[PDB]
Design a protein around this ligand. Structure first.
Ligand SMILES: Nc1ncnc2c1ncn2[C@@H]1O[C@H](COP(=O)(O)OP(=O)(O)OP(=O)(O)O)[C@@H](O)[C@H]1O
Length: 252
RNA sequence: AUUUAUAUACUUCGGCUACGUGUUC
C-alpha cells in the first residue's frame, strides 16, 4: 500500500499578489492538480500496471495498491530518487513529494479484525515521519554552494531562486498565465514533449480541442488527453479528469 | 366694590466618499 504526499501546496499556491491574480489561482490549483495526475499516471506506467490501481487522489495525497514484489520496490525507490531530483531542480523548497509504503496481506483487506484501520494508520504514520528526513547529506551540501548568476523574484510568484524575464516575469508564471488564458475556452489538455508548461518527466502540457485531439489520436502520438469534466469523449487515452472550473466573469 | 388668569389642535415633515486605484523596480 503506497501513499504519496505533496509538501508545500498551501504556501506555493498563496504567493500571489498581482493584478491577474484570479487567472493564476485557477491556473495554479490546476497546475498542482495536473502535476499530481501526471506523476501518478507516469508511476503507473512504470509499474506496467492499470489505472484502476489508484484508490484515491485529491489535495496533495494519493493512495495506491500495488504489487508487493522486490521488483516493485526497487522501481518505486528509483522513481522516488529521480522525482526528488527533479523537484529539487525546479523549486527546491516550495514543492516536495514524499513516498511511503507498508506491507499488507489479503487477510488485512478483507476486514478481519479492523486491522485495515491499523495498516491505514501505519502507512499514514510512515508517510508523515519520512517527511522529517527529506534531504541526504550530499544534497544539502549541493544546495548551499551555488554562486550562480541569477535574477530576482518573480512578481506574480514569490521566489528568490527563480529568475525573471520580460516584464519581470519568469518562465513558469508566464506559462501559467498562458494556460490560464486558454483554460476558459478550451477543454482538453495534452501531455506532449514540446508543449508550454514544464512538467515532471521531461514533458509539457498544452491545450487542445476534441478535433485536433482526434487528429493526434490518428497521429498515433504518445499522448494523454486530460479533459475538463467531459464524458463520452472516447478520444485516445480518455481521461475525464475531475475538476470544478467555474467563473461567473465569463457569463458577461 | 366683588369670580376667572390663556384655553383645546398640531411640538421637523420630504429625499438618502462618488473618482484617479491597490504593488511594484
Ligand atoms: N492544487 C491545489 N491548489 C490549492 N490548494 C490545494 C491544492 N491541492 C491541495 N490543496 C489544499 O491545500 C491544503 C494544504 O496543503 P499543505 O501544503 O498543507 O499539504 P498537505 O497535502 O496537506 O500535506 P502536508 O501538510 O502533510 O505536507 C491541502 O490539504 C489541500 O486541501
Amino acid at each position: 500500500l503506497l501513499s504519496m504526499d505533496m509538501s508545500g501546496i498551501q504556501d506555493f499556491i498563496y504567493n500571489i499578489s498581482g493584478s491577474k491574480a484570479l487567472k493564476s489561482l485557477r491556473s495554479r490549483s490546476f497546475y498542482l492538480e495536473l502535476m499530481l495526475e501526471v506523476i501518478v499516471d507516469q508511476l503507473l506506467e512504470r509499474l506496467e500496471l492499470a489505472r484502476a490501481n489508484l484508490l484515491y487522489t485529491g489535495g496533495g495525497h494519493a493512495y495506491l495498491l500495488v504489487s508487493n514484489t522486490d521488483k516493485v520496490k526497487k522501481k518505486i525507490t528509483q522513481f522516488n530518487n529521480e522525482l526528488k531530483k527533479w523537484f529539487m531542480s525546479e523549486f527546491t523548497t516550495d514543492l516536495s513529494l514524499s513516498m511511503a509504503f507498508e506491507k499488507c496481506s489479503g487477510d488485512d483487506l478483507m476486514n478481519t479484525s479492523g486491522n485495515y484501520r491499523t495498516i491505514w494508520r501505519n502507512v499514514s504514520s510512515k508517510l508523515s515521519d519520512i517527511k522529517a528526513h527529506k534531504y541526504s547529506a550530499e544534497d544539502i551540501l549541493k544546495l548551499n554552494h551555488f554562486h550562480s548568476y541569477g535574477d530576482r523574484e518573480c512578481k506574480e510568484c514569490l521566489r528568490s531562486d527563480i529568475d525573471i524575464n520580460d516584464d519581470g516575469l519568469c518562465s513558469i508564471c508566464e506559462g501559467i498565465i498562458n494556460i490560464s488564458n486558454d483554460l476558459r475556452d478550451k477543454s482538453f489538455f495534452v501531455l506532449s514533449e514540446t508543449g508550454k508548461l514544464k512538467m515532471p518527466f521531461n514533458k509539457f502540457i498544452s491545450v487542445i480541442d476534441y478535433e485536433e485531439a482526434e487528429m493526434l489520436v490518428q497521429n498515433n502520438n504518445q499522448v494523454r488527453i486530460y479533459s475538463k469534466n467531459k464524458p463520452y469523449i472516447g478520444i485516445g487515452i480518455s481521461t475525464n479528469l475531475w475538476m470544478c472550473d467555474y467563473d461567473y466573469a465569463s457569463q458577461n
